[PDB]
Ligand binder design. Structure first.
Ligand SMILES: Cc1cc2nc3c(=O)[nH]c(=O)nc-3n(C[C@H](O)[C@H](O)[C@H](O)COP(=O)(O)OP(=O)(O)OC[C@H]3O[C@@H](n4cnc5c(N)ncnc54)[C@H](O)[C@@H]3O)c2cc1C
Ligand SMILES: Cc1cc2nc3c(=O)[nH]c(=O)nc-3n(C[C@H](O)[C@H](O)[C@H](O)COP(=O)(O)OP(=O)(O)OC[C@H]3O[C@@H](n4cnc5c(N)ncnc54)[C@H](O)[C@@H]3O)c2cc1C
Ligand SMILES: Cc1cc2nc3c(=O)[nH]c(=O)nc-3n(C[C@H](O)[C@H](O)[C@H](O)COP(=O)(O)OP(=O)(O)OC[C@H]3O[C@@H](n4cnc5c(N)ncnc54)[C@H](O)[C@@H]3O)c2cc1C
Lengths: 163, 388
């Protein structure tokens, strides 16, 4: 069952009897040995966050990291966020930058010019937080809100500290 | 009146010789360096200003010469022959100026046209956006009236002289209702480049006219005084529309200048390069090519002349300017590639003049309205003669 095709039923709510399960004989043709668990590189990833010119500075991108550790996620940007001094060049998603298409793409303060849509309209799922309502980015985003990003984003990093 | 004439006014023969001498003694010698480097040709622009080959539409009472569209076409053909990158940078000024000329008040014209009279300042036409060029009516740059000002929010694309300009003519969306028509939705502003909020983008790298600067410009909370709106709120789309009557022919003259350069090059060379015992021009196929190329140029020339004559006569010339920009642009490309062709391997080579003319020319079928757009206009104009 695809997880995000259904809703998590209430963790509390009903109460349920618990019986001992029936037994098996150890088979021992396989044995577990070891493990190793894990902010990705941008292109290989499955969860990308990106900020446009609407963040206004590079020290302002802390809010996008804040969240791209909650989504153990990658951090890209538009060419207009790069150009304004905010971030270096190896992160620019788009036509002149790294073509990406992971599971989850967040566009934060991105107007959504055809040149930036060309670097990511193939992301499986696309998020759009942008205060202007007639902002090209909405067409291509499965999901989005007509809202200030400094209120909506630090509010999202606080709905995934717990869940 | 009298019948037809295809004879220049003496005065226009004088304008012609000045532009030519400039184009030929000053541009030609240096266009391939400025093309190789993308360096903005500041000396040549200052020298063309010096010589009064620039800002020529400005009316006399703002310190200009108040020349016509025919006069302006002569001069461009001449500059364009030398270099289209240079001539485009000169020309941009007229495009920026034109809505202020055709639609500005006395304070607006005197102030903003007038300053162009006393220093070689540049101005730019700020319309095209990442998402809309052909479909002007698709632009979304916001203007909200807040006080006795407007606040401009938007991004602009492919702005010639965009990072060299004292001020801009800017077209913006005044009416939030998306159902609002183009005749109501847009307002045109005069905006000074040095306003806080305005961020000039990087120099954009194109195939052609490389010395011309063309740039993205972003407006972030840009404060625009009520007195810099053109006719009023909602007149923007008519005002931008109207600039074209006076400007299409001149870009058509540009395409013709480059066309003529291509021809002259390819002819010179076909009078010295021989193959199979004879000169190129004695091979019939080459000769036919030069012939068709000469037709094409003569016909383009008349076409833009005709457009320009129409508007100087106080007629609206939409139909004729559109034929000019369609025909001139299509044949400038045709002539450029032929010129290469005729120079064989040398023509493809960078130490010969022609490959550039080929890289330069393609833009003529794109900007100041695509080849396709021009046909839609011509079609619409043509067909209306038959609706009764
Ligand atoms: C040849 C060429 C290639 C290009 N290649 C690329 C490419 O590779 N990648 C790329 O990104 N661009 C590229 N561009 C540029 C592209 O056309 C646009 O400049 C770019 O997509 C816009 O960047 P942006 O969305 O970050 O900035 P803007 O378009 O200015 O977007 C800012 C947005 O932020 C919003 N905003 C502002 N404040 C807030 C707030 N606090 N809360 C919520 N929203 C807010 C605004 O409403 C606006 O919509 C290219 C351009 C050219 C000419
Ligand atoms: C070098 C350069 C300098 C420029 N300088 C300026 C300037 O300073 N000021 C300014 O405002 N703009 C400037 N521009 C923008 C330029 O005017 C536009 O690119 C042009 O007007 C149309 O461009 P577009 O890219 O939006 O074409 P698109 O709208 O993307 O059209 C692409 C293609 O589709 C065709 N097409 C579109 N719609 C139709 C339709 N309805 N029917 C049939 N065919 C259609 C077009 O013919 C074209 O071939 C400049 C552009 C360049 C390349
Ligand atoms: C990128 C490049 C790579 C090349 N690589 C090689 C290679 O590896 N090996 C090699 O040997 N060569 C190579 N060449 C040379 C190329 O093969 C020749 O340029 C080509 O054969 C044309 O010859 P030309 O340049 O001397 O032009 P010309 O022979 O001077 O022809 C000039 C023009 O007149 C036309 N013309 C000539 N004669 C006639 C005629 N009889 N009737 C009608 N028209 C005529 C031609 O079509 C052309 O348009 C290369 C060239 C280039 C540009």
């Amino acid at each position: 069952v695809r997880g995000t095709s259904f809703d998590a039923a209430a963790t509390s709510g009903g109460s349920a009897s618990s019986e001992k399960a029936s037994s098996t004989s150890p088979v021992e043709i396989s044995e577990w040995l070891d493990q190793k668990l894990t902010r990705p590189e941008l292109t290989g990833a499955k969860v990308v966050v990106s900020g446009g010119r609407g963040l206004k500075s590079g020290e302002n991108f802390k809010l996008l990291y804040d969240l791209a550790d909650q989504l153990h996620a990658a951090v890209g940007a538009s060419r207009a966020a790069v150009d304004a001094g905010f971030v270096p060049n190896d992160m620019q998603v788009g036509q002149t930058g790294k073509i990406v298409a992971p599971e989850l793409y967040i566009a934060v303060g991105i107007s959504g010019a055809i040149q930036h849509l060309a670097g990511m309209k193939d992301s499986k799922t696309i998020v759009a937080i942008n205060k202007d309502p007639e902002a090209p980015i909405f067409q291509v985003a499965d999901y989005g809100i007509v809202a200030d990003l400094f209120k909506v984003v630090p509010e999202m990093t606080e709905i995934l500290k717990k869940k | 009146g009298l019948g037809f004439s295809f004879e220049f006014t003496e005065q226009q023969k004088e304008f012609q010789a000045t532009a030519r001498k400039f184009a030929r003694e000053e541009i030609i010698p240096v266009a391939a360096e400025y093309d190789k480097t993308g360096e903005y040709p500041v000396p040549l622009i200052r020298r063309a200003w010096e010589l009064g080959l620039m800002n020529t539409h400005i009316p006399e009472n703002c310190g200009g010469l108040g020349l016509g569209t025919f006069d302006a076409c002569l001069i461009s053909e001449e500059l364009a022959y030398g270099c289209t990158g240079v001539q485009t940078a000169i020309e941009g000024n007229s495009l920026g100026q034109m809505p202020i000329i055709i639609a500005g008040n006395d304070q607006q014209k005197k102030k903003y046209l007038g300053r162009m009279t006393e220093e070689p300042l540049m101005c730019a036409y700020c319309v095209t956006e990442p998402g809309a060029g052909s479909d002007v009516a698709g632009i979304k740059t916001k203007a909200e009236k807040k006080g006795d000002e407007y606040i401009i929010n938007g991004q602009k694309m492919w702005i010639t002289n965009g990072g060299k300009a004292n001020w801009y003519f800017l077209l913006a969306r005044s009416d939030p209702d998306p159902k609002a028509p183009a005749n109501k939705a847009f307002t045109g502003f005069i905006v000074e480049a040095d306003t806080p909020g305005i961020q000039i983008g990087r120099k954009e790298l194109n195939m052609g006219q490389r010395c011309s600067d063309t740039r993205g410009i972003v407006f972030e909370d840009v404060k625009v005084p009520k007195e810099n709106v053109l006719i009023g709120d909602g007149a923007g789309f008519k005002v931008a529309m109207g600039a074209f009557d006076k400007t299409r022919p001149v870009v058509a003259a540009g395409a013709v200048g480059l066309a003529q350069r291509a021809l002259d090059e390819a002819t010179k060379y076909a009078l010295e390069r021989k193959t199979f015992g004879k000169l190129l021009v004695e091979h019939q196929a080459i000769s036919f090519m030069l012939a068709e190329m000469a037709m094409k140029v003569e016909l383009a020339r008349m076409s833009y002349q005709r457009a320009a004559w129409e508007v100087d006569s106080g007629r609206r010339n939409t139909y004729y300017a559109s034929i000019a920009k369609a025909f001139a642009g299509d044949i400038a490309n045709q002539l450029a590639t032929d010129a290469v062709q005729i120079l064989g391997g040398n023509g493809f080579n960078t130490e010969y003049p022609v490959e550039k003319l080929m890289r330069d020319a393609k833009i003529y079928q794109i900007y100041e309205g695509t080849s396709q757009i021009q046909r839609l206009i011509v079609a619409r104009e043509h067909i209306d003669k038959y609706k009764n």
